């Protein structure tokens, strides 16, 4: 029928009827998209159409130009740009004129205007957009909707467009935003839209802020909006101050004292939770930023050079005034507790905890009073806060100032574990655990240990919000006791730690608490096993016989339930069985890594035997086909080479996992196993490489899917390489294909860009080190990659450019530089010195963030040295 009738039906509840329209419009966009969008835009522009139709039409245009999937989003944009320059010209003039003619609140034009902009802006294909949008907001005769919707467009633009290509007009974008935000603006709806619009645009106003005149004008309009009689705006503007402080910290000194200080604390001191939440954040962010600077200042000094950015210690100054606002807000506990609800009460504890790490000592004399004053308050709210606050400040004052107070705090803490209110007891175990975690010497004491250990054992039977916390308190205690025993006993494991006489009592309680039916509440099950692993790992050698017994119990459970899973009744049953499986599978990874190696083999020969029996019955599909390949992976560790025996019977299941590409998740964990199979059987995985490498190349040969995967199959190609040596020749061919194309990859798919670049790098190393030698005869397969050295260095050269550099990538790229020199032998020097950016990437690596990013980077220049004295 008529596009108008088909649209009013896309929103028809009748399932069959809805599909009809969704397939009519669907196919209409296949046959002739240009015509479609012109007619759909006309329908949106005509005010005379029904609200439903109009909105249905704009949602259609929106989903022809954008999506959540970046690869798909980047595809709808290319399809749009390839259309007739005039068809697009009509679509734009309807979509753009629609602004202001919509009585419905959320405009559809905006998200279209937005959708089209992200595609046309980069290429200067829509020169109407900015001056027409700015014109609609600054014209004095513009209606409420007109200003509102237009700012709603700019709000989406900055948020959806490539962060880079917009700085040119940052001048225009900003003049329209701050105009909407002006106190004299009659509508609060407009103000909020604009204030929210500025929030997503500050990311490129760097050129504007570098100018006193404007920066100052922006700051005023922002602070003035923190006084608006519409909470929605108040917060939005307060959100800006938070952002403005994280991007333009270098500036804030001028405004801080005379304005920001008054505004920030008034919100914290508010009665409105929304506003309160934003003011507390403001300061914990300052605390985070002035910390990230103390690191810069500490590293630059270790080089003597001036730190590019300087701290102005604002927290240190605000400390006096913040503490009482925080400690008092701790008092607003949420009786009806929810470990999923974020509120000022919880927010206030984090800020105190952060204020303690940032300023250190100074904090102590400001919190102690409240503590000793409320520690025994008849009303728990002030009693809990007196204990919460105590904990938050345990990190980041001198260990030689808290120990005496802590010791002098133990007995009262011990008692608080017998408190009438759940909340007080919940926070008490956390404090005890933090005391055990940061200042062990007070827990592992010949005075309070016995009564403390007794406190925690009973605590395991308390309520889930207490029981869950006690476990961490135990594990933190056990790690310490172990460390306090193996300071230096000449051997690897200690003789006996002061939990040796109670170990057997300790372990069985955690074995019970694991099955407490109310285990889902407050993450008890998970925490309970997590504690058992940590307490078994950290244990005295004379507790072994007790660890054996515990290990026999965990195996027994991965049976009671691992034949459960070959008899599933429901998807609820399906789900919990796997949740138990996983918890036993992970508690398995540490008991094996603990018992005698001789013993750890017989346990593994049993579990793998059972996993082999479970795989055959559920090869088709599988609830039991994800966390099981993860259980297999560790059984493939506590046998190493010995796993060869299993390989043939397990091979096809490595594969059905590999073939299952629709559930990329299984597949991901499957592809990882292959790597582990490669390192356990160096040179016995040869009779399996070839199916696997096949099942893997097919996985990449066609698109679709989804694309976390690609980077891990690539990385594994390297593992295979190393393991099968001159058998890689067969595939090296197509391998450098995917590699070649995947390096040229371009785009928070960042973070994914880095992850993919690291995979390629890791693969290149695997192939090179794989086809070169140890005790060889001569060498020379590697040189089959010789023609790529150029690209490899040139792909690494481009990595040196991107201001991203995840220190993991610098490592694998640095390490690869080393490999090429060791293979490729002084022709590489001329190619590396041709790219100055490579020298800079190695120097950046020689500075340690993460460790042995330095070691791989210190070793690549090392190899690139004594080339210089050879020929």
């Amino acid at each position: 029928m008529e596009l108008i009738t088909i649209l009013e039906k896309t929103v028809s509840p009748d399932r069959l009827e809805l599909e009809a329209a969704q397939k009519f419009l669907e196919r209409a966009a296949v046959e002739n998209l240009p015509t479609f969008l012109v007619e759909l835009s006309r329908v949106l522009a005509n005010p005379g159409n029904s609200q439903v139709a109009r909105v249905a039409a704009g949602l259609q245009i929106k989903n022809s130009l954008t999506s959540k999937d970046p690869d798909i989003k980047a595809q709808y944009q290319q399809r749009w740009l390839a259309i007739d320059a005039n068809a697009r010209r009509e679509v734009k003039n309807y979509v753009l004129q629609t602004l202001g003619t919509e009585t419905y609140r959320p405009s559809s034009a905006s998200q279209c205007v937005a959708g089209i902009a992200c595609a046309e802006i980069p290429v200067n294909q829509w020169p109407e957009l900015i001056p027409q949008l700015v014109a609609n907001v600054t014209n004095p005769n513009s209606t409420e909707h007109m200003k509102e919707s237009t700012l709603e467009a700019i709000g989406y633009i900055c948020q959806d467009i490539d962060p880079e290509q917009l700085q040119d007009k940052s001048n225009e974008i900003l003049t329209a935003i701050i105009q909407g935000m002006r106190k004299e603006e009659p509508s609060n709806n407009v103000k909020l839209a604009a204030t929210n619009a500025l929030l997503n645009s500050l990311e490129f106003t760097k050129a504007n802020f570098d100018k006193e005149s404007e920066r100052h004008f922006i700051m005023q309009v922002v602070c003035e909006a923190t006084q608006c009689p519409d909470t929605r705006v108040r917060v939005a503007a307060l959100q800006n101050l938070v952002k403005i402080m994280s991007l333009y910290y270098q500036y804030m000194e001028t405004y801080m004292g005379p304005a920001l200080f008054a505004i920030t604390i008034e919100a914290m001191k508010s009665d409105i939770d929304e506003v309160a939440l934003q003011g507390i954040e403001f300061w914990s962010n300052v605390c985070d930023e002035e910390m990230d600077l103390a690191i810069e200042a500490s590293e630059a000094a270790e080089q003597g050079r001036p730190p590019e950015h300087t701290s102005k210690f604002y927290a240190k100054g605000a400390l006096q005034y913040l503490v009482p606002i925080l400690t008092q807000t701790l008092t607003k506990q949420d009786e009806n507790d929810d470990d999923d609800d974020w509120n000022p009460c919880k927010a206030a504890g984090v800020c105190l905890m952060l204020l303690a790490t940032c300023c250190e000592d100074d904090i102590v004399p400001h919190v102690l009073p409240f503590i000793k004053e409320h520690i025994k308050n008849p009303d728990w709210r002030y009693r809990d806060a007196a204990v919460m606050a105590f904990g938050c400040i345990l990190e980041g004052p001198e260990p030689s100032q808290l120990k005496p107070l802590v010791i002098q705090a133990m007995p009262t803490l011990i008692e608080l574990m017998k408190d009438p209110s759940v909340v007080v007891r919940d926070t008490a175990a956390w404090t005890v655990g933090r005391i055990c975690e940061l200042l062990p010497e007070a827990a592992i004491n010949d005075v309070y240990l016995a009564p403390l250990l007794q406190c925690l054992i009973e605590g395991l039977s308390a309520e889930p919000r207490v029981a869950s916390n006690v476990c961490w308190a135990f594990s933190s205690l056990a790690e310490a006791a172990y460390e306090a025993a193996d300071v230096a006993d000449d051997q690897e494991e200690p003789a006996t730690y002061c939990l040796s006489s109670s170990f057997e009592l300790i372990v069985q309680k955690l074995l019970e608490t694991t099955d407490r039916p109310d285990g889902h509440q407050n993450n008890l099950r998970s925490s309970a096993y997590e504690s058992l692993m940590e307490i078994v790992k950290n244990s005295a050698k004379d507790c072994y016989p007790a660890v054996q017994k515990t290990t026999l119990v965990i195996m027994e459970r991965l049976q009671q339930v691992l034949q459960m899973e070959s008899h599933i009744q429901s998807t609820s049953d399906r789900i919990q069985f796997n949740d138990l499986q996983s918890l036993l599978c992970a508690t398995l990874q540490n008991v094996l890594r603990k018992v005698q190696h001789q013993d750890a083999l017989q346990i593994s020969d049993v579990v793998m035997a059972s996993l082999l029996r479970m795989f055959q019955s559920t090869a088709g599909s599988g609830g039991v086909q994800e966390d099981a390949l993860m259980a297999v992976s560790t059984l493939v560790e506590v046998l190493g080479g010995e796993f060869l025996k299993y390989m043939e019977a397990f091979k096809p299941f490595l594969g059905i996992g590999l073939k299952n590409y629709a559930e990329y998740q299984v597949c991901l964990a499957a592809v990882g196993l292959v790597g582990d199979l490669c390192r356990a059987l160096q040179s016995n995985i040869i009779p399996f490489c070839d199916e696997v490498m096949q099942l893997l190349l097919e996985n990449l040969g066609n698109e679709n899917v989804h694309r976390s995967v690609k980077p891990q199959i690539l990385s594994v190609f390297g593992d295979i390489a190393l393991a099968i040596g001159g058998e890689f020749k067969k595939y090296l061919e197509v391998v450098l294909n995917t590699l070649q194309q995947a390096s040229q990859a371009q785009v928070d798919m960042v973070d994914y860009l880095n992850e993919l670049r690291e995979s390629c790098l890791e693969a290149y190393t695997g192939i090179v080190q794989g086809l070169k030698g140890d005790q060889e005869n001569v060498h020379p397969d590697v040189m089959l990659v010789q023609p790529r050295v150029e690209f490899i260095l040139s792909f690494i050269d481009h990595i040196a450019g991107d201001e991203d550099h995840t220190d993991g990538v610098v490592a694998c790229a640095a390490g690869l530089i080393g490999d090429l020199c060791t293979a490729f032998g002084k022709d590489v020097l001329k190619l590396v010195e041709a790219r100055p950016m490579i020298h800079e990437l190695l120097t950046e690596g020689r500075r340690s963030k993460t460790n042995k990013a330095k070691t791989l980077a210190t070793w690549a220049t090392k190899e690139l040295r004594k080339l210089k004295n050879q020929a």
Binding site: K346, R679, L722, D774, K852
Partner: protein, 36 residues
């Protein structure tokens, strides 16, 4: 925003993240020993 931090202790994100980091170090070990 920071709910992860309140009562900081220390599921699907970890075990996975935590497994690769191990599968990664084992790689560094397997490669490094073969480098030198």
């Amino acid at each position: 925003p920071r709910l992860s931090q309140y009562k900081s202790k220390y599921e699907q994100s970890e075990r996975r993240r935590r497994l690769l980091e191990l599968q990664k170090s084992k790689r560094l070990d397997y490669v490094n020993h073969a480098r030198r």
